Ligand binder design. Structure first.
Ligand SMILES: *[C@@H]1O[C@H](CO)[C@@H](O)[C@H](O)[C@H]1NC(C)=O
Lengths: 49, 351
């Protein structure tokens, strides 16, 4: 199964500075975010191979 | 027996008498809840609707202020969005009854606004931030604009806050009515009026209208005294409705003019600082519907007797102890009246 190397850590927004969430897993071909029950739009995701 | 006056024999023991007493308690509470349900739901609905409407107004005003900042002062964004969001968040928190200082809202707004104006509009090019924040108030750079906005918004926000608090306290007292526990003597009298006829072997006999009247006027002597204060509450709310949308929506124009005012003296300011460092329809319909319940506390015993099974003819009826041909003839209440007096004084002082 895919093993997470960098699990996303709970972020805190300070002075309206948008802080992104990191996610890294191996072996992985697709990694997506499910924020509050629903899938996040494809445009918001930034993948690194 | 301790409730059922045994005139002849009796078909019920002491435990059955306790069961009848508990059923009397449940019946009285259910009748009060049925009496209070329409008014309770009316005030709950209006409280929720007005809360959502005020939040919509605050969000729209924040959006309008942000849009006019985007359009007229792009050099102040995105910092402008931060202090506008904080200002209107504190606005909503004050509307919903939280301990927020209105003067502190306006002062923090101008304290955050001045440094970005100086750095991006007047002297283009983090530690010196506090010197600018101090100079804002020490040099009175915004003139009378902060006090103008302060009074303009405090006047409307206090009346809106007290309107919501009044709605919530009305919900509270109307909720208390159907949970009003009564005396033990009244428990025994209600047990006699509703059930003790069954202990004497009668199946369908109802109590006399006059006996229901004496029993109800017996245990509602305290509850009826609330009627004066409830009427004064209704009328004071009517006094208050006769305001906040226009103020919060003109805030952007006032702030824009204040920014122009500060930019007007930029010559001296830069050198000195470089050296130094359908709503009204809703409240009207609410008051017109609330005036239909002004008799709520005075008509309450009449409701209990007219919705309980009674012999209105006062013929062949139960008088609490025997079947006759013709009939012969509080701490929580104090709290309700105290809170009504308080909210009524607060209302009257507002208008
Ligand atoms: C947003 O995504 C980009 C691309 O992966 C990344 O460079 C940046 O750190 C992210 N920003 C935040 C707020 O996480």
């Amino acid at each position: 199964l895919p093993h997470f190397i960098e699990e996303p850590e709970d972020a805190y927004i300070i002075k309206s500075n948008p802080i992104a969430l990191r996610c890294k897993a191996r072996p992985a071909m697709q990694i997506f975010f499910k924020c509050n029950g629903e899938w996040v739009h494809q445009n918001e995701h930034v993948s690194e191979e | 027996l301790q409730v059922c006056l045994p005139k002849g024999p009796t078909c019920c023991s002491r435990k059955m008498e306790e069961k009848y007493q508990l059923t009397a308690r449940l019946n009285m509470e259910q009748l009060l809840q049925s009496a209070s349900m329409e008014l309770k739901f009316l005030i709950i609905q209006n409280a929720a609707v007005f809360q959502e409407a005020f939040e919509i107004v605050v969000r729209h005003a924040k959006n309008y202020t942000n849009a006019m900042f985007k359009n007229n002062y792009p050099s102040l964004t995105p910092q402008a969005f931060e202090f506008v969001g904080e200002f209107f968040t504190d606005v909503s928190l004050y509307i919903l009854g939280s301990d927020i200082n209105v003067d502190d809202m306006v002062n923090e707004l101008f304290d955050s606004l001045f440094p970005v104006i100086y750095t991006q509009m007047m002297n283009p090019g983090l530690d010196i931030n506090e010197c600018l924040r101090g100079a804002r108030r020490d040099l009175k750079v915004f003139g009378s604009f902060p006090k103008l906005i302060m009074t303009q918004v405090s006047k409307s926000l206090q009346v809106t806050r007290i309107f919501l608090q009044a709605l919530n306290l009305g919900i509270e007292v109307i909720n208390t009515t159907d949970h009003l526990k009564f005396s033990k003597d009244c428990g025994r009298m209600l047990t006699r009026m509703w059930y003790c006829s069954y202990c004497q072997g009668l199946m369908m006999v109802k109590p006399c209208g006059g006996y229901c009247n004496v029993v109800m006027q017996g245990c509602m002597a305290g509850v009826v005294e609330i009627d004066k204060y409830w009427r004064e509450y209704i009328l004071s709310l009517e006094e208050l409705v006769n305001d906040m949308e226009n103020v919060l929506l003109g805030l952007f124009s006032t702030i824009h003019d204040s920014i122009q005012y500060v930019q007007k003296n930029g010559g001296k300011l830069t050198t000195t600082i470089g050296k130094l460092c359908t709503l009204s329809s809703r409240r009207r319909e609410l008051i017109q519907k609330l005036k239909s319940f002004i008799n709520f506390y005075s008509a309450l015993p009449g409701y209990i007797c007219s919705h309980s099974p009674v012999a209105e003819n006062d013929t062949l009826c139960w008088n609490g102890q025997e079947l006759v041909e013709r009939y012969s003839q509080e701490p929580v209440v104090s709290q309700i009246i105290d809170k009504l007096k308080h909210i009524n004084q607060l209302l009257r002082t507002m208008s």
